[PDB]
Write an enzyme that holds these catalytic residues in place. Structure first.
Site, PDB file in Angstrom:
ATOM      1  CG  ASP A 128     -30.367 -10.294   8.352  1.00 58.36           C
ATOM      2  OD1 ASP A 128     -29.584 -11.161   8.792  1.00 58.36           O
ATOM      3  OD2 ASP A 128     -30.220  -9.072   8.563  1.00 58.36           O
TER       4      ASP A 128
ATOM      5  CG  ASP B 169     -38.624  -9.164  15.507  1.00 53.16           C
ATOM      6  OD1 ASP B 169     -39.710  -9.658  15.872  1.00 53.16           O
ATOM      7  OD2 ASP B 169     -37.699  -8.893  16.302  1.00 53.16           O
ATOM      8  NE  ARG B 170     -38.463  -3.908  11.089  1.00 56.05           N
ATOM      9  CZ  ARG B 170     -37.689  -2.848  10.902  1.00 56.05           C
ATOM     10  NH1 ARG B 170     -36.435  -2.826  11.322  1.00 56.05           N
ATOM     11  NH2 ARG B 170     -38.188  -1.783  10.281  1.00 56.05           N
TER      12      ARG B 170
ATOM     13  CG  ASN C 155     -29.798  -8.455  15.692  1.00 57.94           C
ATOM     14  OD1 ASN C 155     -29.813  -9.115  14.654  1.00 57.94           O
ATOM     15  ND2 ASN C 155     -30.218  -7.197  15.747  1.00 57.94           N
ATOM     16  CG  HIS C 156     -34.238  -9.126  14.790  1.00 56.72           C
ATOM     17  ND1 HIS C 156     -35.285  -8.232  14.855  1.00 56.72           N
ATOM     18  CD2 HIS C 156     -33.221  -8.470  14.183  1.00 56.72           C
ATOM     19  CE1 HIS C 156     -34.918  -7.087  14.307  1.00 56.72           C
ATOM     20  NE2 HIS C 156     -33.670  -7.205  13.892  1.00 56.72           N
TER      21      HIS C 156
ATOM     22  CG  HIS D 182     -35.516  -9.375   9.130  1.00 53.09           C
ATOM     23  ND1 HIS D 182     -35.504  -9.292  10.505  1.00 53.09           N
ATOM     24  CD2 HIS D 182     -34.316  -8.904   8.714  1.00 53.09           C
ATOM     25  CE1 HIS D 182     -34.348  -8.795  10.905  1.00 53.09           C
ATOM     26  NE2 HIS D 182     -33.609  -8.550   9.838  1.00 53.09           N
TER      27      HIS D 182
ATOM     28  CG  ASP E 190     -31.672 -10.841  12.364  1.00 58.81           C
ATOM     29  OD1 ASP E 190     -31.632 -11.194  13.561  1.00 58.81           O
ATOM     30  OD2 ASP E 190     -31.317  -9.708  11.977  1.00 58.81           O
TER      31      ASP E 190
ATOM     32  CG  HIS F 175     -26.941 -12.046  12.943  1.00 58.19           C
ATOM     33  ND1 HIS F 175     -27.663 -12.224  11.782  1.00 58.19           N
ATOM     34  CD2 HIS F 175     -27.467 -10.954  13.549  1.00 58.19           C
ATOM     35  CE1 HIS F 175     -28.587 -11.284  11.692  1.00 58.19           C
ATOM     36  NE2 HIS F 175     -28.491 -10.502  12.752  1.00 58.19           N
TER      37      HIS F 175
ATOM     38  CG  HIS G 262     -26.572  -7.273  12.243  1.00 59.24           C
ATOM     39  ND1 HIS G 262     -27.889  -7.111  12.616  1.00 59.24           N
ATOM     40  CD2 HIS G 262     -25.835  -6.604  13.161  1.00 59.24           C
ATOM     41  CE1 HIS G 262     -27.946  -6.376  13.712  1.00 59.24           C
ATOM     42  NE2 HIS G 262     -26.714  -6.055  14.063  1.00 59.24           N
TER      43      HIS G 262
ATOM     44  NE  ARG H 139     -26.766  -2.796  13.619  1.00 52.78           N
ATOM     45  CZ  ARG H 139     -27.598  -3.272  12.703  1.00 52.78           C
ATOM     46  NH1 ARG H 139     -28.909  -3.247  12.880  1.00 52.78           N
ATOM     47  NH2 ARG H 139     -27.102  -3.790  11.583  1.00 52.78           N
TER      48      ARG H 139
END
Ligand SMILES: [Ca+2]
Ligand SMILES: [Ca+2]
Ligand SMILES: [Ca+2]
Ligand SMILES: [Ca+2]
Lengths: 361, 6, 160
Positions: A81, A112-113, A141-142, A83, A109, A190, A272, A245
């Site tokens: 990830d 985000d974040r 998943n993002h 992010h 990923d 992922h 993940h 999740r």
């Protein structure tokens, strides 16, 4: 008295107002100049919208021509990830080798974040255009409309660029492959496995060009996690509801081993999940003595609070070397890209009120 | 007494 | 003694009631409120925006707040208009009172409030980017119209 007009901390670099044009980013042969792009993005510099949209669409076209399950050969650097940690992504490429002579595989990923997510997309998509056969990007998943609108990537694109750039990223994320078969030994996803995915051909038969549904095989590839007690076989059920999740499943040690034996694979490489050491290896298989599952987390000091290390898997010469690295400094952003007026105004009205009611009491 | 980061 | 002129939304009884409160705050009966007399109240000693409010009330810039400045300053923070409350907050950041929020004064006003919760380099970065995203005419400063376009939808500034 300090100057009310001049910047107080003058030596702090000011982000340039110049927006890179097509001639500055792409050469006459159509190859993006990643060195010019890297230096400009590290200064918090922005591109012209047409140039940013060109990078996203040309990268999406390359991803659309790839299969759901990629066939990647060794050597290769596998990354977890990101992010939106763009300034940590720069250290990653220093640590994993230059993309001009090193094969790369990202497990998703990218947004985000973190508060530099569009810079990660633009730079990785430019590297995908420059190295279409040696740099590979998987979906996380993002990389979807729901999580980018729930988090800050939707807001980030509205602040730095426009919603047209966001919508272009959403269509580009639909083209991202879902898995990778690395050196005919490792399954690279992922999240993890699925109760509806027992062979590698179950991945090839999926329709990935859509928003990830709330349930199903494509959802489990991006969302599933190993059991919290992975290896300590106390839960005989191979797939149980993932309560952390709110969707997908937990998969157990026998679940992974059944998939590895039936598909003649050595291990499953996924991400993940954040790790303090940047990685985590799970219970080895009985026949190989190799970890049946490996988590890679390439976001150091996650959310600027975890103080965790990051890592990438550098597999070469029949050796999988886990390469750790620490975080790098980056310019500061308020949460959710909030300006200083929206941030401080409730505090202004509060403290001015507290003062005036006490002088009038 | 001081503005905090949200 | 010639009559006093002032511009406020208070009636005669409210002005007289604020006059009695003004004399009480005027510890030396000098006709003006000094910073020391404002800081005599223990509730204001830890308020980081006291000096900004005093400088806003001090319209003539002599350093102290007389009864006229006291009345007109309190008037702008109570039957008031929505733009008046939004302009009073604008004046909190506009230290030099030129009608535009510049980079230096925006840093200093924020530094009074944030204290040590943010480093100077971090505060300078978010001050730069705030002006970059809020400046619409490209002059490097934030006008009142540009200030309202950011905090217009934010609805808390009234006393009794
Ligand atoms: Ca006095
Ligand atoms: Ca005065
Ligand atoms: Ca000013
Ligand atoms: Ca302006």
């Amino acid at each position: 008295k300090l100057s009310t007009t001049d910047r107080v901390v003058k030596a702090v670099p000011f982000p340039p107002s110049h927006r890179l044009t097509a001639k500055e980013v792409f050469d006459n042969d159509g190859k993006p100049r990643v060195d010019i792009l890297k230096a400009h993005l590290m200064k918090e510099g922005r591109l012209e919208e047409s140039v940013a949209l060109r990078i996203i669409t040309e990268g999406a076209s390359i991803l659309r021509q790839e299969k759901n399950l990629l066939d990647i050969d060794a050597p290769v650097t596998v990354c977890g990830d990101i992010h939106g940690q763009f300034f940590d992504l720069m250290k990653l490429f220093e640590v994993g080798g230059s993309p001009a002579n090193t094969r790369y595989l990202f497990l998703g990923d990218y947004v985000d974040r973190g508060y530099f997510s569009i810079e990660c997309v633009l730079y990785l998509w430019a590297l995908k255009i420059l190295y279409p056969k040696t740099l590979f990007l998987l979906r996380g998943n993002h990389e979807c409309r729901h999580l980018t609108e729930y988090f800050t990537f939707k807001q980030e694109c509205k602040i730095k660029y426009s919603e047209r750039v966001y919508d272009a990223c959403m269509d580009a994320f639909d083209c991202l492959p879902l898995a990778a078969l690395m050196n005919q030994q490792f399954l690279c996803v992922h999240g993890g496995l699925s109760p509806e995915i027992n062979t590698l051909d179950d991945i090839r038969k999926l329709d990935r060009f859509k928003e990830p549904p709330a349930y199903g095989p494509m959802c489990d590839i991006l969302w599933s996690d190993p059991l919290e007690d992975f290896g300590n076989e106390k839960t005989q059920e191979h797939f149980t509801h993932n309560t952390v999740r709110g969707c997908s499943y937990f998969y157990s040690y026998p679940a992974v081993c059944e998939f590895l034996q039936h598909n003649n694979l050595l291990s499953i490489l996924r991400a993940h999940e954040a790790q303090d050491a940047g990685y985590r290896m799970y219970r080895k298989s009985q026949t190989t003595g190799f970890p049946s599952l490996i988590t890679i987390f390439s976001a150091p000091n996650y959310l600027d609070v975890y103080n965790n290390k990051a890592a990438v898997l550098k597999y070469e010469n029949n050796v999988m070397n886990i390469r750790q690295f620490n975080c790098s400094p980056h310019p500061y952003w308020l949460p959710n890209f909030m300006d200083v007026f929206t941030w401080s105004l409730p505090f202004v009205g509060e403290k001015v009120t507290e003062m005036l009611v006490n002088v009038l009491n | 007494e001081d503005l905090e980061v949200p | 003694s010639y009559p006093l002129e002032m511009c406020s939304h208070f009636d005669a009884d409210e002005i007289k009631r604020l006059g009695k409160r003004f004399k009480k705050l005027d510890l030396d009966n000098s006709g003006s409120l000094s910073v020391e007399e404002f800081m005599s109240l223990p509730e204001l000693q830890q308020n980081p925006l006291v000096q900004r409010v005093i400088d806003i009330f001090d319209t003539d810039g002599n350093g102290e707040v007389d009864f006229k400045e006291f009345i007109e300053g309190v008037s702008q923070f109570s039957k008031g208009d929505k733009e008046q409350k939004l302009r009073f907050a604008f004046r909190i950041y506009d230290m030099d009172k030129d009608g535009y929020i510049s980079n230096g004064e925006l840093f200093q006003v924020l530094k009074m409030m944030v204290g040590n919760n943010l480093k100077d380099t971090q505060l300078q970065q978010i001050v730069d980017k705030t002006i970059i995203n809020a400046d619409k005419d490209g002059d490097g400063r934030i006008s009142f119209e540009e200030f309202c376009a950011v905090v217009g939808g934010l609805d808390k500034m009234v006393v009794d």
